[PDB]
Amino acid sequence: DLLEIYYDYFREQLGEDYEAALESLRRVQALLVNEVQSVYQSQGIDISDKHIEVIVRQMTSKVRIDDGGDTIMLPGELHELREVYNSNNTMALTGMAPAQFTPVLLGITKASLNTNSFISAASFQETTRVLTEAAIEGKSDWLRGLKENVIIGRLIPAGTGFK
Amino acid sequence: HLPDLVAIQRNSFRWFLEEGLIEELESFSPITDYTGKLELHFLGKQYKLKRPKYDVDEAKRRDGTYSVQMYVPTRLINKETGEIKEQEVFIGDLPLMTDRGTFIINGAERVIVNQIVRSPGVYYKSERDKNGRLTHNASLIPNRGAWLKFETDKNGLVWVRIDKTRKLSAQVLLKALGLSDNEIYDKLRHPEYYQKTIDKEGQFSEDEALMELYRKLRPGEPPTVSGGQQLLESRFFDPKRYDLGRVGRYKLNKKLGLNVADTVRTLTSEDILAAIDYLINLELDLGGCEVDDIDHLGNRRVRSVGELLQNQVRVGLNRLERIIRERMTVSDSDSLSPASLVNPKPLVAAIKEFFGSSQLSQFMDQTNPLAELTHKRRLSALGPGGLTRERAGFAVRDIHPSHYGRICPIETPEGPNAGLIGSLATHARVNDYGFIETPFWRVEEGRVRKDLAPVYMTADQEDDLRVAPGDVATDDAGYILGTTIPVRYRQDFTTTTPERVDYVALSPVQIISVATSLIPFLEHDDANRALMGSNMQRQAVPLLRPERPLVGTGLEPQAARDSGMVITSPVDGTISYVDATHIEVTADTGEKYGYALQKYQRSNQDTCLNQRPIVFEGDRVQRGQVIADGSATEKGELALGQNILVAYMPWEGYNYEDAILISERLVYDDVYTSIHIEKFEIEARQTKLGPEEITREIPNVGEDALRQLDENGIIRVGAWVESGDILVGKVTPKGEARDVRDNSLRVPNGEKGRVVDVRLFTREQGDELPPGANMVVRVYVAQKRKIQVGDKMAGRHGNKGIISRILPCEDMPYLPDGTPLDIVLNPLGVPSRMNVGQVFECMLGWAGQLLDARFKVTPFDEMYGAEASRLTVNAKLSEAREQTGQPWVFSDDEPGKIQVYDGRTGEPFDRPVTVGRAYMLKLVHDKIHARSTGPYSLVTQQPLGGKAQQGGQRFGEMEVWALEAYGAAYILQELLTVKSDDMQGRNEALNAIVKGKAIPRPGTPESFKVLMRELQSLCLDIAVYKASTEDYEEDKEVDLMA
Amino acid sequence: EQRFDYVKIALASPERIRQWGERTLPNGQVVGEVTKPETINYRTLKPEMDGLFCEKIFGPAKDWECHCGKYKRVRHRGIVCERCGVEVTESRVRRHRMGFIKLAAPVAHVWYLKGIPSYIAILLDMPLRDVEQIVYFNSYVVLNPGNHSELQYKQLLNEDQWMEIEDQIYAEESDLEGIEVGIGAEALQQLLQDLNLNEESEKLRQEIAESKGQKRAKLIKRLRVIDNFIGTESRPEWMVLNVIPVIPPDLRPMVQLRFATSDLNDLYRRVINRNNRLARLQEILAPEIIVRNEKRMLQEAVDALIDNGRRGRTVVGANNRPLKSLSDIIEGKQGRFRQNLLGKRVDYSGRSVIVVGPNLKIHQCGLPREMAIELFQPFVIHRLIKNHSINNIKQAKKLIQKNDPLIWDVLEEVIEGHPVMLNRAPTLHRLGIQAFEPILVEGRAIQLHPLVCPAFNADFDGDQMAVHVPLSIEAQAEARMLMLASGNILSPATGQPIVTPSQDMVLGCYYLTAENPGAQKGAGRYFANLEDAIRAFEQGSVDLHAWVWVRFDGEVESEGESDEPESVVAADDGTVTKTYRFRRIRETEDGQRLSQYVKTTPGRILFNNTVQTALIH
Amino acid sequence: EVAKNLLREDLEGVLSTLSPRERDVLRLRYGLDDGRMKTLEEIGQLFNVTRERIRQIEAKALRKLRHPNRNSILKEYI
Amino acid sequence: DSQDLLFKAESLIVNSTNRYHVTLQIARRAKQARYEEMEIKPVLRAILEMSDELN
Ligand SMILES: [Mg+2]
Ligand SMILES: [Zn+2]
DSSP states (O other): OHHHHHHHHHHHHTHHHHHHHHHHHHHHHHHHHHHHHHHHHHOOOOOOHHHHHHHHHSOOOEEEEOSSEEEEEEEEOOOHHHHHHHHHHHHHOOOOOOOOEEEEEEOOTTTSSSOOOHHHHTTSSSSSHHHHHHHHHTTTEESSSSSHHHHHHOSSSSGGGGG | OOEEEEOOOTHHHHHHHIHHHHHHTTTTTOOOOOOOOOEEEEGGGGEEEEEOOSHHHHHHHHHHOOOOEEEEEEEEEEEETOOOOEEEEEEEEOOOTTTTTTTEEEEEEEOOOOEEEEOHHHHEEEOOOOOSSSEEEEEOOOOOSEEEEEETTTOOOOOETTTTTTTTHHHHHHTTTTOOOHHHHHSSSHHHHHHHHHHEEEEEEEEHHHHHHHHHSSSSSOHHHHEEEHIIIIIIIIITTOOOHHHHHHHHHHHOOOOOOOOOOSSOOOHHHHHHHHHHHHHHOSOOOOOOOOOSTSSEEEEEEHHHHHHHHHHHHHHHHHHHHHHHHSSSSOOOOOHHOOOOOOHHHHHHHHHHSSSEEEOOOSSSSHHHHHHTTTEEEEEETTTTTOOOOTTTOOOOOOGGGTTTOOOOOOTTTTTTEBOOOSSOOEEESOOOOEEEEEEEEEEEESSSEEEEETEEEEEEOEOTTTTTOOOOBBBBOOOOOOESSSOEEEEEOOOSOOEESSSSTTTTTTTTTGTTGGGOOOHHHHHHHHEEETTTTEEESSOOOSOOOHHHHHHHHHTTTOOEESSEEEEEEEEEEEEEOTTTTTTTTEEEEEOOBTTTOBBBBOOOEEEOOTTTOOTTTTEOTTBBBSSSSOEEEEEEEEEEEEETTTTTTSEEEEEHHHHHOOTOEEEEEEEEEEEEEEEOBBBOOOEEEEEEOOGGGGGTOSSHHHTTTOOOOOOOEEOOOOEEEOOOOOOOEOOOOOOOOOOOOOOOOOOOOOOGGGOOOOOTTEEEEEEEEEEEEOTTTOOOOETSSSSSEEEEEEOOTTTTTTTTTTTTTEEEOOGTTTTTBBBHHHHHHHHHHHHHHHOOOOOOOSSOOTTTTHHHHHHHHHHHHHHHHHHHHOOOGGSSSSTTTTTOTTTTTBOSSSOOOOEEEEEEEEEOOOEEEESSSOBBBSSSSBBOGGGGTOOEEEEEEHHHHHHHHTTTTTHHHHHIIITTTTTTTHHHHHHHHTTTTTOOOOOOOHHHHHHHHHTTTTTTTEEEOOOOSSOOOOOEEESOOO | OSSOOOEEEEOOOOOHHHHHHHEEEEOOOOBBBOOOOBBBBBOOBOOOOOSSTTTTTSOSSSSBBBBSOOOTTSSSSSOOSSSSOOOOOGGGGGOOOOOOEEEEEEEEOOOHHHHSHHHHHHHHOOOHHHHHHHHTTTTEEEOOOOSSOOOOOTTTEOOOHHHHHHHHHSTOOOOOOOEEESHHHHHHHHHHHHHHHHHHHHHHHHHTTTTTHHHHHHHHHHHHHHHHHHHHHHOOGGGEEEEEEOOOOGGGOOEEOOOOOOOHHHHHHHHHHHHHHHHHHHHOOOOHHHHHHHHHHHHHHHHHSSSTTTTOOBBBSSSSSOOOSSGGGSSTTTTHHIIIIIEEEEEEEEEEEEETTTTOTTEEEEEEHHHHHHHHHHHHHHHHHHHSSSOOOHHHHHHTTOOOHHHHHHHHHHHHOOOOOESSSSOOSGGEEEEEEEEEESHHHEEEEEEHHHHHTOOOTTTTEEEOOOOHHHHHHHHHHSSSGGGGGBBBBOBSSSSSOTHHHHHHHHHHHHTTTTTTTTTTTTTTSHHHHHHHHHHHHHHHHHHHHOOOOOOOTTTOSSSSSEEEEOOSSSSSEEEEESSEEETTSSOOEEEEEEEEEEEHHHHHHHHHHHHHH | OHHHHHHHHHHHHHHHHHHHHHHHHHHHHHHTTTSOOOOHHHHHHSSSTTTTTTTHHHHHHHHHHHHSSSSOGGGGOO | HHHHHHHHHHHHTTTSSSSHHHHHHHHHHHHHHHHHHHHOOHHHHHHHHHHHHHO
């Protein structure tokens, strides 16, 4: 609800959705990073802040299409902020009606189940649910992650197998 | 005042034999068929027992079972003709409990564990809503049957939830029981609270009450008054489907304040009404009502072999009665006799399953007498009727104040079983209801009355009294000294004047178990290191020549007499025959007693159970004097380790992080060497091609590898077998003379020793061979193991270590008299782990060596002085210094430290170090494993796991993550495919390595193909695709399975 | 360059399942349908002909050998027999071919019936309870309202209600025509075939435009599912199964120890038995209740096969334990993904207790001979073949087995320069796996460098480690260049050093460099340089903690010093000798330094000299 | 499987020592190529000369192999 | 010596700007080395050569 409060405040104080989402997400991200670091340092443990920043950016990088415009984005869908911004830009570039959205905070399990590869998600949790959803959507997996070149048995796209 | 240590296991079988089987036979005795023409009566009070066949030793050596046969007299009565054909029927085979508290099942010693469960009765609880008030519920739990939950709503409503079904107001249940409004109104004390429910839910009459009860219990069927009545009768009133138990009746009467007889063991109207009244009073805060704690040891019970057996016998008897009724009604003619009517198969099967395949009957722990003793005094919270590992949480595994003197707060496992398995304390005992008691001395006007007999008391009893610990100090006669005395009042620790103390514990070690009672200077140790030492004392290995501790604790002679391996003379006379296998003592004026000693037998844990005599021929012997001793005892008392010279200082890195540096004397003086006997087995089966033959005509073998076979294909007793040596020679008739194939049994890699026994069992000899086998050969191989690099050494105070170096005695530091040390320990490990007691024992052991003495110090010895342990050790060291005459033994500037020199250079170390005599143990367990290529799994084609089958090490997903973080791609890909399940890439990689070429690129591992097939088998059209290169082409599905 | 690019998953049609299992024979006969619930013959231990382990469907039990024994040996490749029609090929095909089972009555795939989103329910816009009741033969459904007035499309009818409707429809005066009802999964199949996805999509979009709240959300979910079906070009009735696939027999092995059988065999036998009984009942015109109960049983059996215990009761085995169905294989910590795909048991691995090797270097580990001779066996064989007079692999293997002296020399010259990876059982971070160089040691325990213990969080009180050996050149290069222990200095989580000396090393350094006023023999003496002071200490002339003076020219950091010179003395020349607390500097008047004497302890001299010697060398 | 590839090579080597016709005869009489042992008559028809000629070649080849020279490694394979 | 190889390794890891790329180059080089030598261990000779070529 802190995210919602920040979004509501910024969508007026500023007036543009994209910047309101950016500022709200920034403030919530800073809060989350600081809280995690404080909890860790209470016991006298030190980790760099980049390690927590990567996780927080994996948790605060999505948006709910509140009400779509001429976009192919139906309401209720979770999409990356960058993709939504680019689509809205090209849509009002041609002169269409853009879409509205609300930034969201996912979590460490809800964000891992929203990946674009069903093999990674099915191998994490709720295998039957993920597999049923993938079968219904007719999804295809292009094997662009470490857990999927690991499962099939290819060179992982990281490290000495980068290219 | 210590009574028999293994008595929780005897009393429960003596009880089973005396009145546990009788109650269950009589409870099912009158069997009647549906026509009511024939009746079988089981006169179960006269069950006789047939003497055991074979023997205890014969059962052990034959790999059989030690049991008896049960015969009960029966009488088949014809309801009309009246012909009664009295007879005695065979009921089953009952395994018998040996003199040590154990059973011998399939030639192996097993022990039935004791289960700590929740006691039957009624338990009240108050739950608080997020925003609502306190609402109270009650649970009525029987020994066996359905539960009866009562609940109070937020509006003042009373609900009942039979089984796990939906709730129903209490009025339905009370009217269905056959109670008018006036009686349930009179019995309740505050009737308006229930009148609210009556008004809100409507006064049900009996007929509609039963209708609604049937409707709610069994929906979808037309309600029927009789239907409901029968449902209730079968649910809570059927003597053969609901049993409160004796403890259940006792608890119900004690809690609810009823007076019902002890014989009635089913729910009655009075019970439910009372329970409801108590719930109402607890809601209204009457004053004499209180919610229950489920972890209290007064609401928890112990079940042992007697109860668990009774239940199994009951199940078997139900099955037997079903079979009897079926084979009684079908018969159209009364040509049946009681012998032909009963079938003992279900009862035999139930008992066999209980004693062989249950999770409450456990393979005995038999490493040493201490492990054996504490395995029979173990209390478990898991099993058929207790908890599960995923359901047990933080609350259940903690120490409840009510454990004081009944369950040890120290001795437990570490890991997933921490807090779920406990050990009975030293003086605790279990009464006939199943509650743990503990003894106390009475205190009158501040005087401890040790003249009167100890008053035992349970957890609930000792909640209103002020109980003092067993370490309070009293003066001459009995008066308690001091002005303030610690007491426990209502599960709390307080202090009182010593005129208001009600009871005092019998001993200072009344709170701990037997393994923890064997740690000297325990009050100078942390509790975690005390746990480690107590756990590790039960993993010590009996050594070649055992030796008593010098700083023992006083319970050693008692901890060894219960394992039943020490022989004491019951007779005050002379010894007439001494031998390695036989002792004979002639009573001063009387008969001769003869004892046979076990020699180099084998335990469940491959240790040796030797027995040796102590006395010599023509020796005067008194009653109760030790005559023979076990493998871990010296002369009466436990002996698990050895006393060695220890110094506390760091070596050149060999003491680093719990590593241990020892001398070479521990190897060539045969200190810490042990005998381990292993068993190998070979089976001659009958294949469809033909049978298998044990013979020396093994193919592809020369006569240089058949030297030690006994012209029958089996190795000879007394032969030294090295690795890969043939033990039993076997040939199989393979199908493809030059037709036999070799699958003879050989020693596993890394095993050697002498062959000490080769037992043979064939169906001709009258032995119970497996279903499809025709010869079972068992070979026992014994070996002597010395201490070596990689072995674990331990002390009694929790200090463990792994030996990392064995130095020649001219490199070890030495004393100012030339004596090299035996072990050097790092002092860095002492202060951070707070096991200071090890620094006391060493010093006292040093004094004991110098004074030719042995000290029996009891834990918590500071009730006599301000610092008793330190003062005793200093005085003893000074006395040793004065008696010996050597001033370097003890120094006044540094009491526990003396000068030590360097064996490599001869220069003394800068400062004196602490040296002493320490009692160290050698721990069990054969862990080194390696693999290149071996057997593979069936479905996934991945290497098997396990040392005994050349198994591989698992590369989990944490290791995959670690390799991904490194940037490793080729190590990961080679590990994942070529070395696990790339069924074609394994052979190519191996061939490339052998030939010296480069390893080719891998393919798709077999587990992926298995997964794709399984997903397709789940009606999923998952497939792998190759994208089209040009424009006007379709993507092509790739066939992996080719 | 890669065989396949993407993995696509879709809803399986019955045609696809038949294609997966139906394979034709040269005789023209098509095979692939499992018709009998028979696994193997009790006497010949040979698979039956139309059962769950048939050789005519799945493949020959023995590679290059016919079922009847007409054809044997490799010589007969691709020769389908005539007496029994088995293809003489490799037995490996028994783990790739599937075969199918044709059902007398359609069943519902429990995944699309009992799910968190119930796709059958969402598509049919019906509550899950109604769909389950129709499926399990507890209520009828109006497949066609026809001409009745009180009957609506997709309305649940109880048995009594249907009897009343029957009385109405069989009345001599009834104008009621065209009413149809159905029960079971066949009714669901008819309802799913009725759906016109395009019209449903248009109607739902129009309704969504004029909607809000939970009604909008539910219509959004329906539209999402419908649009997914439109895009996939899949017919929704494919969620109702008419045929089911049979897993290859090698994935449900029936091995002989007694015979150990997979639970899939029992589940499949239940399905086949119930299907055959249903076919018989439909052939003899059994009473309708019996046929309906058999159809319910078949649905339950297929449910237990797909996912045991998801919908109804759990099918226990011989002992009271659940049977492991198809869903239980691919899920959980013991499922396929987490037990065999994301983590595997690997070859060329060992495990042993670890002891401390204080004389090892940070890039070295002590490997016992017993482990090393087994981990590096192929390399030893290769070097015996090449660099010695060993002829064949068998001779080398027997030489290794007899523990020839040459074996240890070859192994010693093989493992040098060959990195080996050590891992501790809890791998919490990437430093839990580190590469070392093996050194053959005598014993059963692995000798570990004391400076890597904190990285592994390992102590020598019973801890064990696992050893892996890279095989390929790339693997060895990666182990040496990336994972070598001498290159892991800083913690990747904080950047701080992780190979710092600890415990006894810290205590020894502290004692060496401390100050001890009690023992100061030889204090105050001057020394030419650090080597002179060290030599003086070595003889015993000067005590370890004595306060001496050494002529050291360089940067000096002394705790407890003073930036203000304690005493400044100008001699009878332009030279001032400022005497600090721990220094004595002679400086030319308005000039530079001429000498520097540091007041220190020979232990500190030893420490700093050790550091300097390590850096310079 | 690695003592299989290795073996064939050793056999092939000793086969090389034999005359071309001889080795062909042996390979065909034992099915080293096709796994199928062929008779006399199939080689009687396939090869140039007829039956009772291949028997002589087989014996004259084996007698060459039976010598302690050109074939002694395989002795251990037994 | 082992120390020498460790110093040469560290020397090559720097001035490469990509530990992965330089590990790949060392692997390739050592592969070619052993291939054109079967006609010391490959990876070792590869590292020696690459260090001596960095001048
Ligand atoms: Mg450890
Ligand atoms: Zn055939």
